[PDB]
Design a protein around this motif. Structure first.
Motif, PDB file in Angstrom:
ATOM      1  N   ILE A 144      42.967  41.436  43.444  1.00 40.48           N
ATOM      2  CA  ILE A 144      43.336  40.230  42.584  1.00 40.48           C
ATOM      3  C   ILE A 144      43.061  39.976  41.600  1.00 40.48           C
ATOM      4  O   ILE A 144      43.297  39.642  40.737  1.00 40.48           O
ATOM      5  N   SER A 184      43.203  42.904  39.550  1.00 39.20           N
ATOM      6  CA  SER A 184      44.374  42.481  39.036  1.00 39.20           C
ATOM      7  C   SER A 184      45.064  41.931  37.989  1.00 39.20           C
ATOM      8  O   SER A 184      44.956  42.029  36.606  1.00 39.20           O
ATOM      9  N   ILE A 185      44.320  40.559  38.121  1.00 36.02           N
ATOM     10  CA  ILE A 185      44.504  39.129  36.459  1.00 36.02           C
ATOM     11  C   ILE A 185      44.325  39.901  35.832  1.00 36.02           C
ATOM     12  O   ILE A 185      44.667  39.405  34.023  1.00 36.02           O
ATOM     13  N   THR A 240      38.903  44.808  31.455  1.00 37.18           N
ATOM     14  CA  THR A 240      38.492  45.042  32.791  1.00 37.18           C
ATOM     15  C   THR A 240      37.302  46.747  32.659  1.00 37.18           C
ATOM     16  O   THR A 240      37.342  46.546  33.550  1.00 37.18           O
ATOM     17  N   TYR A 253      36.289  34.673  35.234  1.00 41.19           N
ATOM     18  CA  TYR A 253      36.789  35.056  36.272  1.00 41.19           C
ATOM     19  C   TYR A 253      35.664  36.337  37.128  1.00 41.19           C
ATOM     20  O   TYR A 253      35.697  37.182  37.712  1.00 41.19           O
TER      21      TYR A 253
END
Lengths: 578, 578
Positions: free
Chosen positions: A151, A154-155, A164, A286
């Motif tokens: 998750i 991905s986000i 990322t 995140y």
């Protein structure tokens, strides 16, 4: 090997999938909180276009909705999630032990002659228990942390491609580090467990043999021997600890460079005119989603390492070989006429050592009562125990009714041989319960018969709580002559076609012996009977006395004849009333 | 009781304080991340006072710094924190067992007659191990969660005294709920452990008595008996599980109403004028600080409950009474002339049961060799074991050299009584190692002497690896006559002033017996010697034969005299040739 252990989980897959599902349906809850903070703040006040009677209504359905979810929905999820997780593993363990116990009962005298009870038990109990984490931390939690990582990754992949990447840089090293430690911890755990096992083994052996420790007041000396094993265990446990501590700091230091090599880059990109300083704001938010699970998995990792060690030890025990195996030809054979034939049998307990029974040839026809006598350490017991096939002859063959012992099914052969060993056993149970071992499915009437037969029934009644008197652990609460007679009872109850009596009189006075002698002479009337004896006199009536010396049969004959021969036998007998 | 357990931790207070300190110095780290984030964002990116060459510069100092802290400072903190925590508890456990083992060696024959080894061991190992969490989760973690709660609560109170009362509202209930479950879980845990204990006990007893299970092929029957205990354990474990699951959901549902009721009132209060959104919003970011720890403590709680159960069981075992105690008068007494006096002794193993030795009066002068004979179950062994004081006489007194047995120090008395019991013990060790039990501090030369004495030295040499041959567990790898002789060895090695021989010939052939008979007649020349025997002939030479019937001394005399009396004794003897 995981496949192996998995086989135990198999019949519980669904309950486990279920445990995982409900597991996922949990993250939804923690998020409801921060979601609710936004509703009152931006949906009742920051709205600015609501009544002070209308907004004080939405807050009574929102403070109404929250309560419902949390005071009604969540509780059941919470419960089921745990109960499920546990109920599952706990049944699985139960299952594994069910199997281990049958394994044990299937090992051979040999195994048990060279193994320590306490050590074995440690495995059946402790090591197994330890594999519990593997089901919980392994098959039911690790995943949720990976789902989280997906998750997250991905986000982040949307928010920004290279950012990322900035994170994943750590990933490989993380993996490398785990790999680097895993193995060593697995061993350290293994070696640790083993130490525990050895203290187990020690405690067992000593606590049960204290009689001796007490007699010579060697408490101090033995308390030392204990401390060696207790210390050894401690040491090993520390080595293990040190490494876990070590490896933990390691894997995390790696996992920590993670948000750094990210934030750093996230700035040198937002300012270098690559991306929205809002993207950086969002993304970096995140960071907890990525390097959070990675931190938990470090712990997850550790726990598992230990678990693997345990399942190792467990399987190791499971993989032990059955020395006496049945083999395809297995065949429940009824022994109709006790015809025993020992053709050129030779026995060795080990390849390294010297044989104990060298070349033995003896034929015993149905009904005959054969006595075995000789200096102690000669071989009688060993020979004898070869028949119930407690060990397999090294060179030769033993045949009952023409059938080779090996061609019988263990239980069959053994069940038809009533055996009274010299060192007889009693469980911490009731008198009755003990006799019942001879024939578990027996009439409370038949028992009392056996008893009367073994000259036991009488003293049993004088026992507090009679046939129900709880004998002590190991059968301590009884005389020698008493324990022994209960063993004889078992025989009558078993009422087999073949009777082997290895010094079945050892502890009885002259009188009691007389009785049992008569009782047996009766039971032995028409049965094949093998007797090992030192008290010659209770053997004279034998059909054939066999003298055994240094693993050989030296003399053979009727008391009468052997006495005439003025040989080996006479020598021994002659020592009595001389 | 916590005070008790604490006594074990005492010598480790500092290491524990240390573990807690370093523990606190950890929260500082997780906060550094968002600080590096806020600092990047709100500090360098939006300073509105930064050369593109300055902001980048100040960014770098914030990272170079980050790496240092995380790649240099944190690792050591992480390590020490864990290593410390473990090293501490692991030494503590070590200590507890050190004590438990001495406790065990100090219990009495009685204790062990009515207790199951496996069950005892389960406590010494499993239950103790279980108290580990109490040190970790209890004395080293719980606190950090309370410190967190204090910190958190303070902030709330200065932010709004009447909204923290919207929070703290939950607190009492939370506490009430814990209290409600605690106890029941403690029992369920207790009952659970006990079940495990019983499977332990079962496994021990059976694995060690398999010889019997094998002989009657009662594997199936016993595998059942196993499943009862294995199942029982499973059941109990489930009951326990169900409740934990239950109580968990409970305590949390309460802990969850927490953030809600702050929002339920807090929002309503903003409306009426209590304070504005600026406050309601700020009093809600910290919500994680309060109802976070409260959630962890739920788990902390649980773990402890179980731990308490364990320490219970441990202490329960620790609190067992020593039946044979030394008492203040204790006095290491040298027995110079083996004068034993049994004055009106009467013995009962229990108040409920009937006495076993009723009124016994016998005097044994130094040097005399007294034989004890009679039907089995009469009392000889019991009588005999009263001297080494394995049990205390019920009514009467036994005096050695005028001194009452009770006035000796256990070790002293026992050490001077060379005792060969009827059911003799051997540890899974080497031949030598076993003889050494008679006198641990002995010359490899003296051993071989004892051996030659006991007629053992010879067969020991023929053993693979001779004096160093590892006998089997329980001493299986040897004959009966062989195990026995090693027991006799121990006697010579002990070379005591008083020698008690309870059927010390049971398993030897006629010949070996002759030898040992001579060997003993020598050693017994000038020593007080008590002999229990069934093979009369090896007792004739006695100075005085004592006949024992139904707990009484019926006849007394010289073989010659007793034979003349044509009484009890003659009857028995007379049964030999007859």
């Amino acid at each position: 090997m995981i496949k192996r252990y998995l086989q135990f989980v198999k019949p519980y897959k669904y309950r486990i999938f279920a445990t995982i599902i409900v597991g996922i349906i949990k993250f939804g809850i923690p998020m409801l909180i921060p979601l609710l903070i936004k509703y009152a703040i931006d949906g009742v006040i920051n709205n600015h276009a609501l009544t002070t009677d209308e907004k004080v209504h939405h807050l009574t359905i929102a403070i109404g909705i929250a309560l419902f979810i949390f005071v009604i929905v969540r509780p059941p999820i919470e419960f089921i999630r745990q109960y499920l997780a546990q109920w599952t593993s706990n049944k699985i363990l139960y299952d594994i032990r069910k199997k281990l116990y049958n394994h044990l009962q299937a090992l051979s005298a040999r195994f048990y002659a060279n193994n320590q009870v306490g050590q074995v038990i440690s495995r059946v109990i402790n090591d197994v228990e330890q594999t519990k984490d593997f089901i919980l931390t392994g098959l039911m939690n690790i995943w949720l942390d990976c789902i989280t990582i997906i998750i997250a990754l991905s986000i982040m992949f949307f928010l920004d491609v290279k950012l990322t990447l900035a994170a994943l840089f750590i990933f490989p090293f993380y993996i490398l580090t785990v790999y680097v430690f895993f193995g060593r911890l697995r061993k350290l755990t293994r070696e640790r467990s083993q130490a525990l096992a050895e203290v187990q083994g020690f405690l067992h052996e000593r606590v049960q043999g204290i009689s001796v420790v007490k007699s010579f007041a060697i408490e101090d000396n033995e308390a030392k021997n204990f401390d060696k094993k207790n210390t050894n265990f401690l040491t090993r446990a520390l080595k293990h600890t040190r490494w876990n501590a070590y490896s933990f700091a390691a894997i995390n230091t790696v996992t920590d460079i993670g948000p750094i090599i990210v934030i750093g880059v996230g700035a040198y990109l937002a300012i270098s005119g690559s991306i929205t300083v809002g993207t950086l704001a969002a993304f970096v938010g995140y960071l907890e989603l990525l390097f959070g699970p990675l931190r938990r998995l470090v712990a997850s990792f550790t726990t598992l390492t230990q678990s693997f060690a345990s399942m190792d030890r467990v399987f190791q025990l499971i993989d032990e070989d059955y020395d006496i195996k049945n083999g395809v030809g297995a065949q429940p054979i009824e022994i109709k006429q006790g015809r025993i034939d020992i053709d050129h049998v030779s026995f060795q307990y080990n390849d390294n050592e010297a044989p104990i029974l060298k070349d033995i040839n003896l034929s015993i026809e149905k009904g005959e009562t054969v006595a075995f006598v000789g200096m102690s350490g000669g071989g009688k017991s060993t020979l004898i125990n070869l028949i119930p096939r407690f060990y397999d002859v090294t060179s030769g063959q033993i045949l009952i009714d023409g059938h080779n012992i090996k061609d019988f099914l263990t239980g069959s052969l053994r069940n038809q041989i009533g055996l009274v060993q010299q060192d007889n056993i009693l469980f911490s149970d009731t008198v009755k319960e003990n006799i019942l071992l001879g024939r578990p499915t027996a009439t409370d009437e038949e028992v009392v018969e056996a008893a009367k037969m073994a000259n036991a029934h009488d003293f049993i009644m004088n026992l507090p709580q009679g046939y129900d008197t709880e004998v002590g652990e190991r059968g301590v609460k009884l005389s020698g002559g008493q324990k022994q007679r209960l063993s004889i009872a078992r025989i009558f109850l078993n009422n087999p076609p073949i009777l082997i009596l290895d010094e079945a009189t050892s502890a009885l006075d002259l009188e009691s012996e007389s009785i049992i002698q008569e009782a047996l002479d009766v039971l032995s009337k028409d049965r094949t009977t093998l007797i090992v004896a030192h008290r010659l006199s209770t053997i004279t009536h034998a059909d054939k006395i066999v003298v055994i010396e240094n693993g050989h049969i030296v003399e053979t004959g009727t008391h009468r004849e052997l006495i005439a021969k003025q040989g080996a036998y006479e020598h021994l007998y002659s020592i009595q009333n001389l």
